[PDB]
Write a structure and sequence with these properties.
The structure is a homotetramer. By secondary structure, chain A is of the alpha+beta class. Chain A contains 16 helices and eight strands. In chain A, the strands form two sheets. In chain A, strands 1-8-3-6 form a four-stranded antiparallel sheet. Chain A has a four-stranded antiparallel sheet with strand order 2-7-4-5, with no helix packed on it. The longest helix of chain A has 30 residues, at about 180-205. At the A-B interface, helix 8, helix 9, helix 10 and helix 11 of A face helix 7, helix 9 and helix 12 of B. Bound molecules: the ligand CCCCCCCC/C=C\CCCCCCCC(=O)O[C@H](COC(=O)CCCCCCCCCCCCCCC)COP(=O)(O)OC[C@@H](O)CO (8 copies) and cyclic guanosine monophosphate (PCG) (2 copies). One cyclic guanosine monophosphate binds near residues 332, 341, 351, 352 and 361 of chain A. Chains A, B, C, D: One of its GO terms (cellular component) is membrane.
């Protein structure tokens, strides 16, 4: 927590040089009442690399280290103190190689807090404005010298380098000399490239913007276009469509057994233990068993979703499996579907007299709303029951 | 159904303010014979938030609620009644924060009726025109004052703010003062950003436009480029290609067992019951069985597709499985493939003397057109037959 | 084959109207020595709809039929014969609704011959040029009338409507009147929209251009970045990389068992019969078996790929499975890897004394180049051998 | 290694013609003191096609060969020696068809060293600059003839053809004649097309730029948005999130059993042998077994990842499986979780008294950091142990 303020300070220092250096190459009337900030920022840039090594790499010559090395040394201040000429002063731009280090720091200190496409887009907008400043300083540099206030002759140059980079091109102020025209051609290429990069990053940002909502929309029309071929009845097709509308608006389209298959075994055990915690210590058949038994029955529960009105259990069937209610409600009717016995709710269960006995179903269990209930098969229970002899004697 | 007309009314009210307010900031000669519409619309905006709470959230200070709160209060009408000056009148634009609420309402009331990329594109076109109006009003505001009809001095400003935002840039009318030039730079940035967003949304809209037809086109060339490596004969390769052309033009490329695996168990049971309804109550071996038997044989049927001329059953083979015709036709030939016994059609079946007996095939069953027929294996039938003793005695 | 020439004729007729009608709205000095082509093309458009019904739909009021219906009737020729004025002549553009029918015909008569993105891009380029003609005619229409040759006053208008639609915007010739300026604003919107559609279709065309070569490139770096974490030796890692280079440059990256799983059972049987045809009728253990036996052993062969130098069979091992060579070569060495017994090639086999006997390996079988050989497990052979009693007696 | 220098020489020769030929069509005052380079380069182009056949195709009339054939012959030098006129000289551009051969050579000699989208983008930038030269030569050609230095009248033409292709369009220098205007329209179309191709390739380049980091970011929010529906506790949810942060920052998001399933059987055996090499020759139960035994136990090990504090083995449980530590550390506690017995590290193992015996767990094994350990089930060990009788007698 005390290296992040140092990274913010280094970002401020390099942003300071990025605004100041091409502005003082044009005007040498600056730098003279402003040298102490150069002193402070140069000491900061030369002292960052020991703190770049220690407390940053443990917790000096590399192909991914030398921009910071070339940015560290005071290659500037010699130019502005000794009045080096125009084709030789330009090496004071070597401090601008520091921005690669700040890019590479910012693309990992907050890379998973925010979207990687959005971070790249914001970094590109920052570099484009910060480069439009330098291009405006260059255009202001190679103008014919005339008496003009230093605000207005910068304002026209910045207006020109925004008109050229965004490819609008009013053409109200144009090149005159050939040495202006070569500079104009090369920044037309750079402006078209930057605007292509911006359109590419926005196209990569809004393409993946709705993927969960588009994948579900494709999966819901694949089933519909298939069942229209099979000449299905429209009522059942409407029931399937309202099932998918439920499954989108509750758990966002994702199937249960394919989400918690991407967890390892102890975390999947922990999630299933947290889910079926207030349910499994209620049945009067698993009481008195060990903790070894509950962890093995709790990993073989299978989720199903019954719509409103679906017959879970018909009276008079064979019947094999027990059902644990998790979210919805359900009702229990008689064999003639008239006399309501009772109503069940979440945290309860039904069908427990099927794991131990070969009796046929004794009632009709109809769903009321969407249920989201789990089930346990008789074969799976007796398969993982064969290795526990004490409960194998308990159920007999 | 009576809240949707209220949402349409609120959209009309906020669109009314979005057109009117920057137009009356430039011309104070309006608002005076037009105050009653302000009264009606302000009452509507201040009375929407009780109906935003009740009958909308049940069926007041939140980070996703405060734009509607700041849009609700009559922060306007005080400016236009008391003649507040130019840098202070601009807070009458706070009503324009209402558009966030209308965006968030419209992106969920009709989000699955239409395409989410198309909805975002239409909303962006709406916001771009509705913002081009305000930018034209701003450009018309900071002009040098001269006698000019109020239609033409708006028409040139709207022509300018469309020439700048779409990045054409004729340059026939340009900035003159510095305070115009700063405004021109900032809306050049906004225009390049909006046009990047439009190109990005169109690129995300037409990329996923043919996905079902492109996925099948990739799957049909992956098989062809693989079988060209194996040095396959061109006749069988042409038969595979016409198989995939059939499977595209009938059920749109999708495989049967991977479409109805994305349904839950009761809906998959209901779909299979609707498909094999007029077929399974015709065989003279499953008649007299229970409803528990039919629901378990109907879930283990496996679809296959035979091309025109494919040998389904050769006379003299071992033979294990029964076949149920669903869509196409098929013919039955003798052992020498000469004397046609009969012809079968949809709704019928063949091979029923293989589930119960160890006799060899008694004829040759050749397909005629594309068949789309289901089959049932003998091992699967006898596996799910072992738990039903009465039909296990019936077949003996 | 004789309806395609009629579709080409209808495309020529509607392209004729699309070039001619806005050009003759500006110049009424045409149409008079050119009426017979109108007669022929109008008869063609009114006679296409019986051939649109018969021999096209079997092999009259619908929401996808009425553009052809409105294009069929001679709503034109009345305007140009009776000299209808300017705001009323424009309904002669209703013939231009025929292009929807030609679009919908061309997007299905050759939809799978070529790429669906490329077809949409070419159709959009056609519509953009064909609309730039009409927009040029409109700009030429609402000019101030002056004596000027009819080639040059069209050439400047077409130059303007290409400068505006491609968003270059030289600005050398501009609007003058307000009624020109409104037309300029609306086609600036249309030009920005069309150029957004072109960039979107090119971005959707070149994104999926290399998918087979990019998917393999991702799969080859996922394995490398994983095995670099496990601290693997660089020699084996180089051998894995040259394996993937082989598997790209021969069968284009695709795995064998996931390509021919997307075929149905009879076509998969036919492909496996064509592959293992000149191989399986060579072993002296399957000779004398039936055709029922070969079709069941041929569906359980499993492909493996051995690199140059990989030990297939080590002398002295347990050994269970037989190997069928398909593409590469292999060599057979002794127990001390010195005395070469023989060399094998494609179409041959080795390890046949493992299906019938519990003897240990008798030699060392080293690969020489990449082999691409199939294998058959002993358990699978004896599992599908248990149901054939005669070969079960033959092998004993 | 000595054909790559020849390909570089041919690329240099065709780049030489691509710069020189349209520049000498405008100025016939060249070519005369510069013919010997034409002689050398023409001999190179006519002698490349024998080395294109031999040592390139083995290691003459084809639809993918004839551009090189038409580029080979000296169709030039006759024009510049005999002073052919303007509409007939243009066939000297046929040498420019050589660039297709260089494109097709470069798109395969270094196609998997670098990114296929990046290669296409760099090739398009090369072709766009190399075509902007020729378009500038054409614009310079059809100018009104006036005395002007040959550097400046080229510099304005290149400035114009960069202003038009990047769609900026200052409009400072414009067409004058109609024959200039037709050329301007056709290169406006070409410039809009090229800039659409550049934006499309950048949009296809930066879309797939972070796929491994975006796929993991989607998989980590799918689990979180699902477990928020199940009303899970925030502490376990934080533990799941830090698990996924570990699994990203170590092995880049990929699951173990789905990476080395995309290898064939001998390479998967070799990778597992390299991983479990310094581990399996340490247990005092597998010592004295054969090499046939180790290769079969080493293919059935299953990876699991325990977080810091997860109970691997609880004292008093049933217990079945043995665990092999690979990367992390683990600690062994007593039944009351107080007295630390020992600490284990990588290369070691625990739980070996579970494969042979039906005793219950004798301690508590808690993880300390992230472990990355493999396990072997008792049922799998005894299943692959049943076919080896000597170790089946050794364990008793
Ligand atoms: C290259 C700029 C053109 C330099 C041309 C030049 O040297 O002109 C002379 C004057 O130079 C002079 O006073 C000094 C001329 C150069 C002063 C302006 C420097 C422009 C730096 C732009 C870098 C972009 C930053 C990108 C950051 C991401 C005369
Ligand atoms: C966001 C908004 C940033 C806006 C920043 C505007 C800050 C500049 C302040 C401003 O309004 O601009 C002018 C100052 O001229 C000057 O030299 C100022 C020159 C400074 C350079 C301004 C360009 C940078 C804008 C970058 C915007 C990108 C953000 C997206 C107006 O002068 P003022 O009326 O006193 O009369 C001057 C007299 O000579 C004639 O009236
Ligand atoms: C900011 C606009 C520039 C305002 C500059 C300004 O205040 O000029 C004075 C006149 O102000 C005045 O009369 C009033 C000047 C401002 C009147 C025009 C307001 C422009 C509002 C644009 C909002 C976009 C809406 C986006 C909706 C999505 C002098
Ligand atoms: C869709 C189409 C919308 C077209 C809307 C056109 C409605 C405007 C009506 C119109 O044709 O425009 C002019 C009216 O000038 C005016 O002030 C009208 C100024 C109103 C502002 C119009 C610009 C909004 C256009 C937004 C289009 C975006 C849609 C995509 C013509 O005047 P009129 O010939 O009487 O002679 C005027 C005399 O002074 C010289 O002839
Ligand atoms: C709308 C065009 C503006 C029409 C304005 C107009 O009517 O002007 C009068 C002259 O009309 C006249 O002679 C006749 C004026 C209109 C003549 C030109 C028609 C333009 C048709 C463009 C359709 C695009 C085709 C798209 C095909 C895909 C005066
Ligand atoms: C592809 C290439 C298509 C090029 C088509 C060029 C065909 C036009 C023929 C042509 O070269 O254009 C002019 C004819 O002017 C005219 O009115 C011709 C006007 C016809 C309209 C031409 C514009 C359509 C171009 C669409 C291109 C898009 C394709 C991508 C030259 O006149 P010419 O030197 O005799 O002297 C005229 C005298 O008055 C002064 O020299
Ligand atoms: C087509 C260029 C227009 C040619 C028009 C023309 O022939 O003009 C005459 C002069 O021709 C002359 O001297 C000679 C006129 C043509 C000389 C310039 C040739 C332009 C070649 C551009 C090819 C692009 C290369 C693309 C490479 C990827 C008069
Ligand atoms: C990368 C950078 C490439 C820059 C290349 C610049 C090389 C050209 C050298 C240069 O600076 O350009 C002019 C030469 O004019 C000329 O004819 C030169 C004409 C040559 C054509 C130059 C255009 C190609 C630029 C392509 C850039 C694309 C790369 C992205 C300046 O003349 P100089 O001051 O002596 O005074 C001339 C006197 O008449 C008035 O001052
Ligand atoms: N008969 C009966 N069963 C009930 C009642 N309430 C819940 N159930 C459950 O409904 C189940 C349906 O018959 P089961 O044999 O599956 O076991 C039954 C009970 O577990 C009730 O009031 N009467
Ligand atoms: N009891 C005991 N077990 C240990 C010790 N160090 C490692 N272990 C392993 O811890 C395992 C836990 O009990 P096991 O029966 O699985 O087998 C035990 C040993 O293999 C130790 O000091 N004491």
């Amino acid at each position: 927590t005390y290296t992040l303020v140092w990274k913010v300070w280094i970002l401020a220092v390099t942003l300071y040089y990025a605004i100041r250096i091409p502005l003082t190459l044009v005007f040498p009337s600056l730098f003279s009442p402003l040298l102490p900030l150069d002193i402070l920022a140069s000491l900061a840039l030369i002292a960052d690399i020991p703190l770049d090594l220690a407390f940053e790499s443990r917790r000096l010559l590399a192909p991914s280290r030398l921009p910071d090395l070339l940015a560290a040394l005071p290659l500037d201040l010699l130019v502005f103190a000794l009045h080096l000429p125009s084709p030789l002063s330009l090496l004071s731009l070597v401090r601008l190689l520091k921005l690669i280090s700040v890019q590479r720091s910012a693309t990992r200190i907050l890379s998973y807090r925010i979207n990687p496409a959005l971070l790249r887009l914001l970094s590109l907008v920052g570099f484009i404005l910060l480069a439009a400043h330098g291009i405006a300083c260059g255009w202001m540099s190679l103008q014919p010298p005339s008496e003009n206030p230093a605000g207005t002759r910068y304002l026209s140059a910045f207006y020109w380098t925004i008109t050229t980079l965004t490819t609008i091109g009013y053409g109200d102020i144009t090149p005159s000399t050939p040495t202006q025209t070569v500079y104009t051609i090369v920044i037309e290429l750079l402006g078209a490239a930057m605007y292509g990069l911006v359109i590419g990053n926005i196209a990569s940002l809004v393409s993946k913007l709705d993927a969960a909502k588009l994948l579900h929309r494709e999966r819901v029309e694949r089933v519909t276009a298939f069942l229209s071929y099979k000449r299905i009845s429209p009522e059942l097709q409407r029931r399937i469509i309202e099932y998918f509308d439920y499954l989108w608006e509750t758990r966002r389209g994702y199937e249960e057994r394919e989400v918690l298959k991407e967890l390892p075994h102890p975390l999947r055990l922990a999630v299933a233990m947290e889910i079926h915690g207030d349910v499994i210590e209620k049945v009067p058949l698993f009481k008195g068993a060990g903790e070894e038994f509950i962890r093995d029955i709790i990993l073989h529960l299978e989720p199903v979703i019954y719509g409103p009105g679906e017959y879970i259990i018909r009276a008079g069937e064979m019947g094999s499996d027990v059902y644990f209610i998790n979210r919805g409600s359900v009702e229990v009717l008689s064999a003639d579907e008239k006399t309501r016995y009772a109503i069940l709710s979440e945290g309860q269960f039904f069908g427990e007299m099927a794991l131990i006995l070969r009796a046929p179903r004794t009632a009709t269990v109809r769903a009321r709303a969407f249920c989201d209930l789990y089930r346990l098969d008789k074969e799976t229970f007796d398969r993982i029951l064969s290795r526990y002899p004490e409960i194998a004697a308990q159920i007999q």
